[PDB]
Design an enzyme around this catalytic site. Structure first.
Site, PDB file in Angstrom:
ATOM      1  N   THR B   1     -76.707  24.947  25.643  1.00  0.00           N
ATOM      2  CA  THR B   1     -76.379  24.627  24.200  1.00  0.00           C
ATOM      3  C   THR B   1     -77.549  23.321  23.902  1.00  0.00           C
ATOM      4  O   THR B   1     -77.358  22.508  24.559  1.00  0.00           O
ATOM      5  CB  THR B   1     -74.975  24.083  24.151  1.00  0.00           C
ATOM      6  OG1 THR B   1     -74.080  24.821  24.374  1.00  0.00           O
ATOM      7  CG2 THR B   1     -74.813  23.411  22.828  1.00  0.00           C
ATOM      8  N   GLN B   2     -78.435  23.704  23.126  1.00  0.00           N
ATOM      9  CA  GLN B   2     -79.709  22.875  22.563  1.00  0.00           C
ATOM     10  C   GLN B   2     -79.357  22.633  21.288  1.00  0.00           C
ATOM     11  O   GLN B   2     -78.451  22.970  20.659  1.00  0.00           O
ATOM     12  CB  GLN B   2     -80.927  23.415  23.134  1.00  0.00           C
ATOM     13  CG  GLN B   2     -81.046  24.828  22.544  1.00  0.00           C
ATOM     14  CD  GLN B   2     -82.256  25.456  23.268  1.00  0.00           C
ATOM     15  OE1 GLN B   2     -82.014  26.102  24.331  1.00  0.00           O
ATOM     16  NE2 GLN B   2     -83.366  25.170  22.839  1.00  0.00           N
ATOM     17  N   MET B 107     -75.399  30.939  27.131  1.00  0.00           N
ATOM     18  CA  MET B 107     -74.990  29.614  26.445  1.00  0.00           C
ATOM     19  C   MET B 107     -76.401  28.674  26.545  1.00  0.00           C
ATOM     20  O   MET B 107     -76.169  27.472  26.361  1.00  0.00           O
ATOM     21  CB  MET B 107     -73.887  28.857  27.074  1.00  0.00           C
ATOM     22  CG  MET B 107     -72.577  29.629  26.738  1.00  0.00           C
ATOM     23  SD  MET B 107     -72.300  30.213  24.974  1.00  0.00           S
ATOM     24  CE  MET B 107     -71.794  28.849  24.529  1.00  0.00           C
ATOM     25  N   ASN B 108     -77.603  29.190  26.525  1.00  0.00           N
ATOM     26  CA  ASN B 108     -78.712  28.370  26.641  1.00  0.00           C
ATOM     27  C   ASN B 108     -79.798  29.453  25.695  1.00  0.00           C
ATOM     28  O   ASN B 108     -80.848  29.913  26.440  1.00  0.00           O
ATOM     29  CB  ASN B 108     -79.184  28.197  28.012  1.00  0.00           C
ATOM     30  CG  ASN B 108     -80.435  27.558  28.099  1.00  0.00           C
ATOM     31  OD1 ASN B 108     -81.260  27.719  28.645  1.00  0.00           O
ATOM     32  ND2 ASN B 108     -80.892  26.679  26.783  1.00  0.00           N
TER      33      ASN B 108
END
Lengths: 141, 233
Positions: B1-2, B107-108
């Site tokens: 998550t960025q 999730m990235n």
């Protein structure tokens, strides 16, 4: 005593590594291959024995490329040679990834060297049955 | 998550009778500050495929290295790397599509919207989209971000259905795409006047145009507009 040639990392009484020497036997017995360093690059050539008329011409290619600027050709146990190239390919990719610049032929050499030298340190591995001629053009020649 | 930091805006494209066209401005925004201006968001992979990326620039740079490696790798032990076994647009897409979905699933994500444009070996035109969620789709025209809202309505007027593609020429097509690039410059607050355009024609090959500029902009009427309702002078 004797039997100093049964395990791969053992020093004989005169300080040799017979398993490595035997590995060389596998090499000398292989097809001939050469390298010629010209004035602005290098040329690689190799002998491809036609064991029969069944081999498709121009097919079973021996010379291999590492990255885009490195060429490899070897004599001896072919499968061993590909295994070495495969390691050079990752070795090169790893270098380029972190330093951006494609790997210098000299640096690549030692990468292959340290790898091969490592297969003469343990009796749980066999030395490479190949001698390799490789090279290319880099930042300085 | 960025969270995206330096970003690229719209990437638009469509396909004509003999190939495809794709364009993207050369801006690298950093919030509202139009920080970087020599950003090429059009990545050519080989000479039958162009990959346009928008979204986070650092991730774009990263997708770029993946693309170059894909090429370096295909050459390995491949005597036909520049022929029958060369990289097809469809391979390049399917690869990214994979990487994109795998990253969202971890999730990235790679904060981007991508359009792979090109011509298949059998002549066919290739145009497909994929974004940070791994979502994909095709259409005679495709655009990311702002272009999805303003560019599509325009380009779709040129090629509304499949049967319109064979009737569209490179001139007509390149035209619409340049006009669209102008409209986006009029209303997208994160766009630049300079852009790059590319054409992948099954006959002429890959024509990559750099440093183009938005020309013929109407501004004159701006003088007759004073106040915001009742002011006269």
């Amino acid at each position: 005593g004797t039997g100093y040639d049964l395990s791969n990392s053992v020093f004989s009484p005169d300080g040799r590594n017979f398993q490595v020497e035997y590995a060389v036997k596998a090499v000398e017995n292989g097809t001939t291959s050469i390298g010629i360093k010209c004035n602005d690059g290098v040329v690689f050539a190799v002998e491809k024995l036609i064991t029969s008329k069944l081999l498709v011409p121009q097919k079973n290619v021996k010379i291999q490329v590492v990255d885009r600027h490195i060429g490899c050709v070897y004599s001896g146990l072919i499968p061993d040679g590909r295994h070495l190239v495969n390691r050079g390919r990752e070795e090169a990719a790893s270098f380029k990834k972190l330093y951006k610049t494609p790997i210098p032929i000299p640096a690549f050499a030692d990468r292959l060297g340290q790898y091969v030298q490592a297969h003469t340190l343990y009796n749980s591995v066999r030395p490479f049955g190949v001698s390799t001629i490789f090279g290319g053009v880099d930042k300085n020649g | 998550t960025q969270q995206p930091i330096v970003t690229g805006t719209s990437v638009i494209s469509m396909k004509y009778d003999n190939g495809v066209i794709i364009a993207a401005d050369n801006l690298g925004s950093y919030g509202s500050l139009l920080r970087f201006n020599g950003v090429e968001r059009l990545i050519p992979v080989g000479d039958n495929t162009v990959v346009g990326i928008s979204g986070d620039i650092s991730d774009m740079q990263h997708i770029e290295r993946l693309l170059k490696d894909l090429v370096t790798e295909n050459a390995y032990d491949n005597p036909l790397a520049d022929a029958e076994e060369a990289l097809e647009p469809s391979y390049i897409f399917e690869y990214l599509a994979t990487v994109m979905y795998q990253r969202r699933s971890k999730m990235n994500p790679l904060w981007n919207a991508i359009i792979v444009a090109g011509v298949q070996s059998n002549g066919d035109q290739f145009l497909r989209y994929v974004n940070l969620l791994g979502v994909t789709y095709s259409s005679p025209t495709l655009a990311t971000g702002f272009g999805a809202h303003m560019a599509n309505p325009l380009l779709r007027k040129v090629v509304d259905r499949e049967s319109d593609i064979p009737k569209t020429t490179v001139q007509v097509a390149e035209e619409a795409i340049v006009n669209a690039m102008r409209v986006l410059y009029y209303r997208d607050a994160r766009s630049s006047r300079n852009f790059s355009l590319a054409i992948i024609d099954k006959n002429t090959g890959l024509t990559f145009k750099k440093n183009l500029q938005v020309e013929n902009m109407k501004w004159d009427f701006a003088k007759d507009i004073k106040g915001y309702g009742t002011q006269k002078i």
